[PDB]
Amino acid sequence: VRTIKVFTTVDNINLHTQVVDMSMTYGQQFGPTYLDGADVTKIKPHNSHEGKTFYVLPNDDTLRVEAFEYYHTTDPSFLGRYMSALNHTKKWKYPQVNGLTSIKWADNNSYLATALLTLQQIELKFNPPALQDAYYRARAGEAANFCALILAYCNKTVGELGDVRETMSYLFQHANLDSCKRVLNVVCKTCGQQQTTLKGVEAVMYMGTLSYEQFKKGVTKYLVQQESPFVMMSAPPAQYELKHGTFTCASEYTGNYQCGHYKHITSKETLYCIDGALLTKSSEYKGPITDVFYKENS
Ligand SMILES: COc1ccc2cc(C(=O)[C@@H]3CCCN(C4CCCC4)C3)ccc2c1
């Protein structure tokens, strides 16, 4: 009986040595099995596979606990959707553009590149170790796994049309924002003190206008107190002037002929427009902006 030793895992942190019979498929021995995202369930082991790490579905209590501790989801479909995405995202190119990890365009991923760029410019503490780990890898240039996880957590497949604001929101719902706060106070003549407080993720997002200045001035009429490391402001795509130094980064969205495309604008020493692998510098920017992000900087 020919055999090799492989490692199985659900988290790539805890590795479980296995002895595999080379005359049977991985599926026969492990159930659904993946090698770097590729479905090798129906494949017989190769000698090149010796010593390699394979992902498996959490079929026992031990693996189920390891998966829950790493991903913080009980969805039994997660790992398979994660692997399905990783098989694609591993083949994407991740150029460094103006000091940030971006993604060369493929598979309708402009929204993911724009989200990835934004995530590198705001302070976020992810709760699932899987996201915290891959976040720090992506920030160092190895972003394939992070992108595959974003797709899995957002319940989106490679190639599906995506929205930066949505993606950011759903990632925020996997972060520790417990200390973020927005207090709204009613401006009235005869209604007394009327106040409501948004804590957590609701505090870091707003829909209706792009301008933080207008929002802080007031929004029937409300005085606002904002306490968060960042805020995401979104509005319908509209021609909008981005002035250097007045924002951290922004999403541009065009919908010519109903085929959308995102670009990312970041404010450094001047305005940089990152469009996947492409980089364009300018002193002024006017375009159809739909998200603007602002950083508190303590
Ligand atoms: C009242 O607050 C808002 C805030 C944002 C708004 C945005 C849109 C958009 O069109 C998105 C632009 C960005 C791109 N997505 C598309 C991406 C794929 C699916 C839709 C579409 C429309 C209305 C909005 C209203």
CATH number of 85's domain:
1.10.8.1190
One-letter amino acid of 115: A
- For residues 40-78, b (16+ Cβ closer than 10 Å) or e, as one string? bbeeebeeebeeeebbbbbeeeebeebbbebbbbeeeeb
Residues 152 and 214 in one domain: no
CB atoms within 10 A of CB 257: 6
Q: How far is the CA of 148 from the centre of ligand 1 (A)?
A: 23
> How much distance in Å is there from the Cα of 268 to the middle of ligand 1?
26
Q: Which of 180, 206, 231 is the last residue of a domain?
A: 180
Cα–Cα distance, 22 to 4 (Å, whole number): 7
Domain shared by 100 and 152, yes or no: yes
Question: What are the DSSP calls for 22-51, one per residue?
Answer: TTS-HHHHHSSEEETTEE-TTPPP-GGGTT
Same domain (yes/no): 205, 152: no
Task: Among 145, 165, 180, identify where a domain stops.
Answer: 180
Shared domain check, 51 and 90: no
Resolution given for this structure, in angstroms: 2.0
* Ligand 1, atom 9, residue with closest C-alpha: 236
> Does ligand 1 come within 6 angstroms of the Cβ of 208?
yes
> Is ligand 1 within 6 A of the CB of residue 207?
yes
| Ligand 1 in reach of 160 Cβ (< 6 A) | no
Mutation probe of ligand 1 site: the residue of 107, 114, 165, 239 with most atoms within 8 A of C-beta: 165
Residue nearest to atom 8 of ligand 1 (CA): 236
Q: Do residues 267 and 197 share a domain?
A: yes
- Domain count for the chain, please give it: 3
170 CA from centroid of ligand 1 (Å): 15
- Do 201 and 113 belong to one domain? no
* 8 Å CB contact between 208 and 219: yes
How far out from the chain centre does Cα 54 lie? 24
Q: Is the CB of 235 under 6 A from ligand 1?
A: yes
Q: What is the residue range of 217's domain?
A: 181-298
103 and 47 in a single domain? The answer is: no
Of 231, 251, 263, 290, the residue with max ligand 1 atoms within 8 A of its CB, to mutate for a pocket test, comes to 290
Residues 117 and 37 in one domain: no
Residues 192, 121 within the same domain = no
Tokens of 233: 């402001």
Contact 249, 273 (CB under 8 A): no
Residue 20 has, within 13 A of its CA and on its CB side, a CA count of 31
Domain boundary among 180, 199, 214: 180
Residue 232 bridge partners (DSSP): 205, 293
Going by C-alpha positions, the residue among 81, 82, 69, 149 that lies closest to residue 115 is 149
Q: Which residue out of 157, 163, 166, 167 has the highest number of ligand 1 atoms within 8 Å of its CB and is therefore the one to mutate?
A: 163
CA-nearest residue for atom 4, ligand 1, is: 235
CA atoms within a 13 Å half-sphere pointing along the CA-CB vector of 261: 10
Q: Does 234 sit in the ligand 1 pocket, CB within 6 Å?
A: yes
Does one domain contain both 220 and 283? yes
Residue 68 phi/psi, 5-degree rounding, is: -65, -40
| CATH label of the domain that carries residue 15 | 3.10.20.540
Judgement on whether residues 172 and 186 belong to the same structural domain of the protein: no
Q: 283 and 195 in one domain? A: yes
User: Is 133 a pocket residue for ligand 1 (Cβ < 6 Å)?
Assistant: no
